[PDB]
Design a protein around this nucleic acid. Structure first.
Ligand SMILES: [Mg+2]
Ligand SMILES: [Zn+2]
Lengths: 34, 653, 1340
RNA sequence: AUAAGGUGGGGUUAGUGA
């Protein structure tokens, strides 16, 4: 039922939609790790 | 390439090559930077669509465009389709040494030659002008000859006058369906700038002079000139490849003239005197002392080759017209007289030319055909065959036959008013009685026309065939038939409806009178449906030929004789009624499989490997043979070809 | 009674039927459409205000910022029309729009705005039209054709038969919106109701029912009837209306009241239903197994457990009847089924839907529409709202609402733009009803379902596209709107707007180029109805039926006129009398017919409203009272002609011409010919080319005044007046006093169009047809334009003709002509070419224009000026040099070190090249005009200065004459004030006219009028200088050009073309012809009187190509010429007014009943004379389309002449000198020549340029190119045995560079020896697929 | 021989009488 979605944009949205938006303090958390 | 100015008409291919190596290099730098799998995954997918977008755009789910939102051209469509290289630039190429313009007649030519304009000649043969012009030393170097053929000095008209002495050229008409569309001629230079063309070629081209353009070509090399004069030359092809009928039949108006020639009104000037020879008949005509269509017992003399091709004089006093004895002088030696002793419709003159080819070979048929063209236009012009509004004659009974017919549909209609009959029954009876009354009007106008001339003959009265112009033009076989004059004088038809069914009220009027509004409206329904069908029908028919020329394409008569005994059995076909195609044409010119056992029980009529020309066909035609097993090409045992003894005749040779 | 001007040449007219209503104004479609596009119309519909009010006001993305609308105001053009034709501009007016911008305060969408502002900002330009309706875009003249397209609405179709080969029809329902998403309902052979959206994949319909928030009992509630079983004494006895017993056999012994009515074995007849309902009982008993065949309607649940006993849409089992039997639910609801009557179709459609609730149904909608993405609630919800319920993304027109409510039998014609539920539910009911057998599907080609668009509809649509796309921009800039700093032109860019609309009029399928070689060319190119274009068909996939005529075409579309070729019937042309609806359907005129009286009022009918009525056909003999003299009359009811009673009728045709277009209303005797040659007569009749000396046609059709007037290529007197000043260039009319306005007295000055280039390179020119000192009429012709004569349209000329074969020069259709024709030079036309020479400034300097050249002779140098330009009127030939253009290759323009050493050494250097504009090869002619345009800031040249001051001098001449005449009006008004209040007729003109204020006059308003006329005098002075000086700023300035060019020089070359054997020329009956031999005079046939005939056609074209109207035409022309030369016979002979008066009086009586009925007795004996010399070259004779003259009248009119009644005169050959037997038909035929002349068809090529991708010669003539040797004649060559020919021609003559060079050398060396080599196109082929991933090689 | 020249769209011409 993955409808042969030959647009690469569509599936690219399907992968980038996995990760949700991080707040700005989580950037302090991650750049802390950096 | 650049277009007009600083811009550039791009190619598609350069565009997608730009895309694919941009794609590649970005993927390389991404592999250098150690990106996450989402990104390089996506980029590799972009490279996949990039590469196939190069190969075959559009076979992937959505194509791509650069500008005008219109999908750009990959490499795959550069081969396929109506303008990929196969049908576009490999089978059909554009050629130098060609010209193209509009045709016209000029009937004074003989048929082994055509008209050609001086400007197109002086353009097409420029390197020959350079060659012979160098030879005569009128100009040494080349650019001197360039300005001589530009500036138009008077000496060059002698020169291309000279070099078109015996150099053949080709002509082409664009819908070149069958192979008579290319024929060759010898150019005669013409003042003016349209192409003049001998009249008998026009029917072979199917090229009316309504504005058809033709194109010409020049074989350059020596061997191709020999192929032109050897095979392409128009005097070669006179019989169709489809069948042994002549295709150099006179077309339309010469047969009007000759039909007017061999006819007779029943009393005329010089009615029934005597005469010793056709020259005197010519003096009587041009002296104006006897009529043209007037019968006179004359003396004529003829020849025949019953012996070893040996032509013998013999003579008598035939009774004939004047004009039959006139065109007797054009006929060459080996003919019977009674070939011209009738009214000479289009069929009679056609088989006249046919038997002239069968008996006297090639050249007398050729020069005979030119001569009958000349006298055809001579006496056609001297005839004065007009048309008039008074020439079309309305039958007086038309009004009454229509009147009783509408009474009859009133009777069946009142059978439906009280409902004694059903719908389709009233429908069918009404359409039948309109068919019957329509036929009554049909032979009404025919019986009124065909023999209306009633005149005295040194006596009281006598009927004969009509000198109405229409009845001559339809009777001779020039144009039209009883059906079209039926649509002129009598009522026209029962036109169909858009459903494909048929309308119950016929078009009662005719073209000499005025149609109403709605009869005309119904008629333009029928006409539009007609020519629309011609358009799309053309579209399919070309595709049919385009197909099956490819599936054959390859079969070459390559051997003499397979030496076999198989084949098929020819019989005359019968539909279930009359014989609709006899024996002697299905057999004509195909070499038998076994020998013809005569139906004399155990007599061999014709041996097993013989050509059946006309004499043999008359031979077993007399003995009423019903079936002959014959050699066919389906049974030819040849590898990669067909032996000639399984095929038979050329049908144009 | 007539005009004074119409009495110059009155036309004899046949025609029995009295006309009751004339032709309309011809250009009415374009004019009322685009008129309705731009005007200040309130109330939205219809126009620009519909666009602005449809989209405005517009708020931000909830940032409480909002812009709104005030008004628009469209300015004047900067340019007139014909100068814009010169320069190349768009004739287009600016668009100034008053908006208004407010900004709400925070915490206040509803609150007071803090700030407002308003400016009138600019948005691009739109073209106007001319009063001849055309548009002018880039110097050119373009015409937008109205488009026929499918009306939005709802439709029903079978697609009978051919699908699935099962003998079973389908039925499908389609909604077409005006703008949005399609929606289609359909069935299957397995009979389930399926729906698809925008032609996509298939879904059952009940999923869209559940999508509209409906439960199952609501669904089965709507689409069916409740059928009532009830738990009763035993076996669940039945309530029954015996209407349901129709069409089915009694499954049990159906019985009631203890009485057997219908046993098993009998179908319950309507007799038996009459028995039952005669007893009128409903409570009956069935046995229980009758209930197991049934499906429960509602959902009965259990009471104790609270559980579902049984769901809807499932067949009862007797054990379920036991489960409910033990339940005690007394009611049992089921549905009615009859496969004959009420099939239970949507039940199984509820079986195959896998879905239950609203939300999942929304999911599979979201998944079929955007495939391949995870579902989300509100994306599905808002998506589903945005498919049908969006005021932005979906719209039906009010037309679509009208068709909708008509289609489902609603009442009021108005409603919403988007649709709702009850719409869809009613549609499904209707489609179910057609599935049942009531109602019918509807054909598409019925003209009540095809709507024409026009111009202003399409320009409105494109303008809406531009506004919403720029509004996507504006909402972006506004939601980030920093306050108090933005004036509404940072959000607004006019470039999306002007980009969209100039995109439209630039490149459309419908903005096609206008052909201009005929007044009839444009006048039929504007009334064209196309079915192609956006939202339209394709030329290659229409069926036969949409190309076919439909019996609703009668009176609305011309049946017979269509282009022959690849699109027949798609490019239909409009009728004569037809107008359009308010809504856009095709209204057509009729006469109101009462009880026995035909009322003379007109009354318009649409397509579908016509069919209820019954129509009197036009040629029905009524007798002066409305009363038809017969009692049966030909009428049409519903697409069929049949004989109806005397009092059944409802309406009458207006006229006999309403069936046809103007394209064939010019055909005389159209009814006597076949439709094929009629069609060819119209379409070839369009393509005629104007001649030098125009000439009226004898056999006219009465339409020539109308099409001559309504084509604006003539110049018509706008007011009634008297001629003051005739000139060849201008014309000056004194206005009569009654039509003279009280203020601004004035006079009329019209400026004629002289020789200018058409669209098709032909001469368009206007000539004065009036004398001086002459009363004119408002609405009367003054200038004969091209192919117009005395207010009458006249294409070619009319000549003597005869019908005989003559030495085969008329063999097929070739036309022999006499030398007399070309000696009179009466087919010679004029052609005009326009050639240009550009001047680009590149790197390595500009380019120059002067007469300095390297290395050509003084021959071409003789014919230039000092500036390098040919003089006006120097006749040139091909290859001559028009403008010497050179490039400085090697110009320096370096540092002042250079200019230093140039001052030291001299300036000698940097001179090379030449690119002079040369005359094309083979053409010749005469220069008539030079145009020079100069980029601004570039020094103008001397010849540009002389033409510049010449234009200047013309302009000041024009304004100076204006001020002379209006000044004469003002000071002559001052003498018209100094009549009363101190007249001094001696002392007024002593001093000149200026000091007429200050004579002795009282202190009143008259000396005041002297003062304000000194004011008006002063604004004549000052305004005169500012108009003149503004004109100097127009002509003086350097005009804009393309970027990178310095100056463009346009050259107009003028060619005269006579005739030559090979030209196509033809009559008006499809009788084509190529002219064959120009044969001297002495060889023509000639009568006993001695006159030559001029053209000898061929009699064989008549019986096959059945067009007998040419020979009827020929007889009538013979009669007309007999009258005119009978007059001139009495006129070169001296004769008084009486005999001419009596004679031509008789010549206008002429037998039968006509409308003409004129007398000569009311005339001046000089207009008698003037009309007499107008008649000395023939008598103009009209003929209506179907009510033209008959045989008895034309024999009668020949009898008025001295010509014999048969019309077949004996002849004599000029070569034999003796009589042809069987005298032949002569007469006069009106003939045309066409612009397929042989001069540009003749082409050859020895050896020219080659293409570069394949070394192959180019295609075409303009590119000096060769012919295509197509593959069919290749098949013709190998059909012969010609082996060497196609190898040579296929290779050497075409492709290999080597073979053609060497063979070229061998010809110029006198050798004939081909060399094969290898075709280059094969080489590019295999290296092409070699560049593809394929190893392909040539082996050993 | 310095007039050259890709891609779309539109318009037109020539292609039966049973
Ligand atoms: Mg033709
Ligand atoms: Zn064989």
């Amino acid at each position: 039922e993955i409808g042969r979605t030959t647009d690469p944009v569509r599936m690219y949205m399907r992968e980038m939609g996995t990760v949700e938006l991080l707040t700005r303090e989580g950037e302090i958390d991650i750049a802390k790790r950096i | 390439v650049p277009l007009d100015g600083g811009r550039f008409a791009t190619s598609d291919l350069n565009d997608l090559y730009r895309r694919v190596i941009n794609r590649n290099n970005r993927l390389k730098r991404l592999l250098d930077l150690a990106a996450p799998d989402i990104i390089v995954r996506n980029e590799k997918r972009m490279l996949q669509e990039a590469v196939d977008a190069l190969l075959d755009n559009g076979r992937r789910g959505r194509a791509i465009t650069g500008s005008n939102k219109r999908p750009l051209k990959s490499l795959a469509d550069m081969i396929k389709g109506k303008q990929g290289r196969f049908r576009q630039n490999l089978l059909g190429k554009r050629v130098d040494y060609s010209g193209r313009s509009v045709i016209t007649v000029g009937p004074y030519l003989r048929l082994h030659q055509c008209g050609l304009p001086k400007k197109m000649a002086l353009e097409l043969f420029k390197p020959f002008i350079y060659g012979k012009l160098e030879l005569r030393g009128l100009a040494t170097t080349i650019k001197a000859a360039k300005k001589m053929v530009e500036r138009e000095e008077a000496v060059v008209w002698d020169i291309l006058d000279e070099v078109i002495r015996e150099h053949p050229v080709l002509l082409n008409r664009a819908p070149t369906l069958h192979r008579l569309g290319i024929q060759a001629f010898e150019p005669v230079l013409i003042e003016g700038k349209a192409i003049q063309l001998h009249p008998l070629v026009c029917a072979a081209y199917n090229a009316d002079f309504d504005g058809d353009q033709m194109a010409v070509h020049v074989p350059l090399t020596l061997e191709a000139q020999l192929e032109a004069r050897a095979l392409m030359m128009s005097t070669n092809n006179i019989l169709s490849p489809a069948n042994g009928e002549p295709i150099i039949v006179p077309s339309q108006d010469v047969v009007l003239g000759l039909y007017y020639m061999t006819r007779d009104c029943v009393n005329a000037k010089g009615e029934g005197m005597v005469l010793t020879g056709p020259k005197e008949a010519e003096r009587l005509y041009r002296s104006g002392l006897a009529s043209l269509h007037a019968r006179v017992k004359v003396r004529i003399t003829e020849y025949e080759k019953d012996a070893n091709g040996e032509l013998v004089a013999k003579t008598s006093l035939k009774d004939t017209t004047v004009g039959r004895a006139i065109l007797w002088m054009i006929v060459p030696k080996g003919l019977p007289y009674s070939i011209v002793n009738q009214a000479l419709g289009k069929k009679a003159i056609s088989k006249m030319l046919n038997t002239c080819y069968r008996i006297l070979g090639l050249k007398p048929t050729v020069i005979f055909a030119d001569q009958i063209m000349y006298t055809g236009f001579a006496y056609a012009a001297r005839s004065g065959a007009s048309v008039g509004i008074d020439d079309m004659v309305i039958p007086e009974k038309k009004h009454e036959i229509i009147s009783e017919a509408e009474a009859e549909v009133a009777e069946i209609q009142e059978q439906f008013q009280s409902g004694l009959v059903t719908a389709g029954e009233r429908y069918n009876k009404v359409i039948d009685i309109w068919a019957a009354a329509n036929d009554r009007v049909s032979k009404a106008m025919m019986d009124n026309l065909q023999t209306e001339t009633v005149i005295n003959r040194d006596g009281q009265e006598e009927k004969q065939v009509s000198f109405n112009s229409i009845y001559m033009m339809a009777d001779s076989g020039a144009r039209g038939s009883a059906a079209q004059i039926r649509q002129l004088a009598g009522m026209r038809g029962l036109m169909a409806k858009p459903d494909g069914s048929i309308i119950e009220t016929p078009i009662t009027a005719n073209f000499r009178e005025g149609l109403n509004v709605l009869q005309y409206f119904i008629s333009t329904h029928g006409a539009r449906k007609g020519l629309a069908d011609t358009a799309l029908k053309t579209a399919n028919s070309g595709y049919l030929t385009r197909r099956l020329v490819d599936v054959a394409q390859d079969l070459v008569v390559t051997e003499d004789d397979c030496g076999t005994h198989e084949g098929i059995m020819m019989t005359p076909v019968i539909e279930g009624g009359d014989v609709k195609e006899p024996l002697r044409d299905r057999v004509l010119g195909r070499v038998t499989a076994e020998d013809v056992l005569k139906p004399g029980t155990a007599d061999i009529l014709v041996p097993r490997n013989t050509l059946l020309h006309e004499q043999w066909c008359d031979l077993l035609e007399e003995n009423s043979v019903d079936a002959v097993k014959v050699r066919s090409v389906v049974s030819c045992d040849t590898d990669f070809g067909v032996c000639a003894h399984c095929y038979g005749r050329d049908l144009a040779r | 009674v007539y005009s004074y001007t119409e009495k110059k040449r009155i036309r004899k007219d046949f025609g029995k039927r009295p006309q009751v209503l004339d032709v309309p104004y011809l250009l009415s479609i374009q004019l009322d459409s685009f008129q309705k596009f731009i005007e200040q119309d309130p109330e939205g519909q219809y126009g620009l205000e519909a666009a602005f009010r449809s989209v405005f006001p517009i708020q931000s993305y909830s940032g409480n910022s909002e812009l709104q609308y005030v008004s628009y105001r469209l300015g004047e053009p900067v340019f007139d029309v014909q100068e814009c034709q010169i320069r190349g501009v768009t004739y287009s007016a600016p668009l100034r729009v008053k908006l208004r911008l407010v900004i709400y305060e925070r915490e206040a969408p509803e609150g007071t705005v803090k700030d407002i502002k308003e400016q009138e900002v600019y948005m691009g330009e739109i073209p106007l039209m001319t009063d001849n309706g055309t548009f002018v875009i880039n110097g050119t003249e373009r015409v937008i054709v109205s488009q026929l397209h499918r009306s939005p609405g709802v439709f029903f179709d079978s697609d009978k038969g051919k699908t699935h080969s099962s003998g079973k029809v389908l039925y499908n329902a389609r909604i077409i919106p005006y703008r949005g998403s399609w929606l289609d309902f359909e069935f299957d052979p397995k009979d389930n109701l399926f729906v698809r959206i925008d032609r996509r994949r298939k879904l059952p319909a009940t999923i869209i029912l559940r999508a509209l928030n409906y439960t199952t009992e609501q669904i089965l509630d709507l689409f069916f009837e409740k059928v009532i079983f009830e738990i009763r004494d035993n076996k669940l006895q039945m309530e029954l209306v015996p209407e349901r017993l129709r069409g089915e056999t009694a499954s049990f012994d159906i019985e009631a009241n203890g009485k057997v009515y219908v046993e098993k074995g009998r179908r319950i007849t309507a007799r038996h239903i009459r028995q039952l309902e005669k007893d009128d009982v409903k409570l009956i008993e069935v046995p229980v197994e009758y209930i197991a065949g049934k499906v429960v309607a509602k959902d009965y649940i259990d009471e104790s457990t609270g559980e579902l006993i049984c769901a809807a849409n499932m067949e009862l089992s007797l054990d379920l009847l036991a489960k409910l039997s033990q339940s005690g639910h007394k009611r049992i609801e089921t549905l009615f089924t009859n496969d004959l009557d009420h099939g239970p179709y949507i039940s199984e459609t509820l079986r195959v839907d896998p879905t239950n609730d609203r939300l999942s149904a929304l999911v599979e909608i979201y998944r079929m529409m955007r495939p391949g993405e995870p579902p989300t609630r509100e994306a599905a919800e808002s998506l589903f709202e945005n498919l049908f319920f969006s005021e932005d993304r979906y719209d039906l027109s009010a037309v679509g609402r009208m068709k909708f409510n008509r289609s489902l039998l609603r009442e009021e014609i108005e409603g919403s733009g988007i649709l709702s539920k009850d719409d869809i539910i009613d549609v499904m009911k209707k489609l179910i009803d057609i599935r049942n057998g009531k109602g019918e599907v509807d054909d598409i080609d019925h003209l009540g379902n095809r709507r024409i668009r026009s111009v202003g509809e399409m320009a409105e649509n494109q303008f809406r596209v531009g506004l919403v796309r720029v509004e996507r921009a504006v909402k972006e800039r506004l939601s980030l709107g920093d306050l108090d700093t933005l004036m509404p032109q940072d959000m607004i860019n006019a470039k999306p707007i002007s980009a969209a609309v100039k995109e439209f009029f630039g490149s459309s399928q419908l903005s096609q180029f206008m052909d201009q070689n005929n007044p009839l060319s444009e006048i039929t190119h504007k009334r064209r109805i196309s079915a192609l274009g956006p939202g339209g068909l394709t030329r290659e996939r229409a069926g036969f039926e949409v190309r076919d005529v439909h019996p609703t075409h009668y009176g609305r579309v011309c049946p017979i006129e269509t282009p022959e070729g690849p699109n027949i019937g798609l490019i239909n042309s409009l009728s004569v009398y037809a107008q359009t609806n308010e809504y856009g359907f095709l209204e057509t005129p009729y006469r109101k017919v009462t009880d026995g009286v035909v009322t003379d009022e007109i009354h318009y009918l649409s397509a579908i409203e016509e069919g209820n009525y019954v129509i009197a056909q036009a040629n029905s003999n009524l007798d002066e009272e409305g009363h038809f003299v017969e009692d049966l009359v030909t009428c049409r009811s519903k697409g069929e002609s049949s004989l109806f009673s005397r009092d059944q009728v409802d309406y009458m045709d207006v006229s006999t011409q309403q069936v046809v277009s103007v394209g064939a209303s010019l055909i005389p005797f159209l009814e006597h010919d076949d439709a094929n040659r009629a069609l060819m007569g119209a379409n070839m009749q369009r393509q005629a080319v104007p001649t030098l000396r125009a000439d009226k046609p004898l056999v006219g059709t009465g339409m020539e005044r109308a099409v001559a007037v309504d084509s604006g290529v003539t110049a018509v007197a706008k007011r009634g007046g008297v001629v003051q000043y005739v000139d060849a260039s201008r014309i000056v009319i004194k206005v009569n006093e009654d039509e003279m306005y009280p203020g601004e007295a004035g006079i009329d000055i019209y400026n004629l169009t002289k020789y200018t280039r058409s669209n098709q390179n032909t001469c368009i020119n206007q000539m004065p047809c009036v004398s001086l000192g002459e009363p004119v009429e408002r609405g009367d012709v003054l200038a004969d334009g091209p192919s117009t004569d005395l207010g009458e349209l006249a294409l070619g000329q009319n000549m003597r003709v005869a019908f005989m074969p003559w030495n085969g020069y008329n063999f097929e259709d070739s036309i022999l002509v006499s030398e007399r024709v070309v000696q009179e030079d009466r087919f010679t036309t004029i052609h005009i070419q326009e050639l240009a020479c550009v001047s680009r400034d590149t790197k390595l300097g500009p380019e120059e224009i002067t007469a300095d050249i390297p290395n050509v002779g003084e021959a071409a140098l003789s014919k230039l000026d000092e500036s390098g330009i040919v003089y006006i009127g120097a006749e040139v030939t091909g290859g001559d040099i028009l403008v010497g253009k050179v490039t400085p290759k090697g110009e320096t323009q370096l540092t002042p070190e250079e200019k230093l050493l140039r001052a030291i050494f001299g300036e000698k250097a940097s001179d090379v090249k030449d690119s002079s504009l040369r005359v094309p090869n083979g053409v010749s002619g005469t220069v008539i005009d030079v145009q020079v345009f100069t980029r601004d800031g570039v020094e103008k040249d001397k010849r540009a200065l002389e033409i510049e001051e010449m234009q200047l001098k013309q302009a000041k001449k024009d304004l100076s004459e204006e001020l002379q005449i209006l000044e004469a009006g003002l000071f002559s008004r001052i003498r018209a004030v100094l009549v009363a209040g101190g007249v001094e007729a001696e002392k007024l003109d002593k001093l000149p006219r200026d000091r007429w204020l200050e004579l002795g006059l009282t202190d009143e308003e008259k000396q005041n009028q002297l003062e304000q006329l000194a004011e008006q005098y002063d604004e004549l002075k000052h305004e005169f200088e500012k108009k003149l000086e503004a004109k100097r700023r127009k002509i003086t300035q350097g005009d804009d050009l393309a970027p990178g060019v310095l100056k463009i020089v346009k050259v107009y070359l003028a060619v005269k073309r006579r005739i030559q054997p090979g030209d196509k020329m033809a009559g008006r009956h499809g009788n084509k012809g190529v002219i064959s031999k120009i044969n001297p005079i002495e060889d023509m046939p000639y009568d006993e009187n001695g006159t030559p005939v001029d053209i000898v056609l061929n009699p064989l074209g008549v019986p096959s190509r059945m067009n007998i109207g040419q020979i009827l035409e020929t007889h009538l022309g013979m009669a007309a010429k007999g009258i005119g030369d009978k007059i001139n016979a009495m006129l070169k002979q001296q004769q008084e007014v009486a005999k001419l008066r009596e004679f031509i009086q008789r010549a206008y009586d002429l037998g039968a009943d006509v409308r003409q009925k004129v007398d000569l007795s009311t005339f001046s004996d000089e207009e008698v004379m003037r009309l007499a010399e107008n008649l000395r070259k023939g008598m103009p004779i009209a003929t209506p389309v179907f009510d033209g003259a008959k045989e008895a009248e034309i024999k009668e009119l020949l009898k008025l002449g001295d010509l014999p009644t048969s019309g077949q005169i004996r002849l004599y050959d000029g070569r034999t000198g003796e009589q042809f037997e069987r005298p032949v038909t002569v007469g006069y035929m009106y003939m045309l020549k066409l612009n397929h002349l042989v001069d540009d068809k003749m082409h050859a090529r020895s050896t020219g340029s080659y293409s570069l991708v394949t070394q192959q010669p180019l295609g075409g003539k303009a590119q000096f190119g060769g012919q295509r040797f197509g593959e069919m004649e290749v098949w013709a060559l190998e059909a012969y045995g010609a082996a060497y020919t196609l190898q040579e021609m296929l290779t050497v003559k075409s492709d290999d560079v080597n073979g053609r060079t060497k063979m070229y050398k061998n010809i110029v060396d006198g050798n004939h020896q081909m060399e094969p080599g290898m075709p280059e196109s094969f080489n590019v082929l295999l290296k092409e697929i070699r560049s593809l991933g394929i190893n392909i090689e040539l082996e050993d």
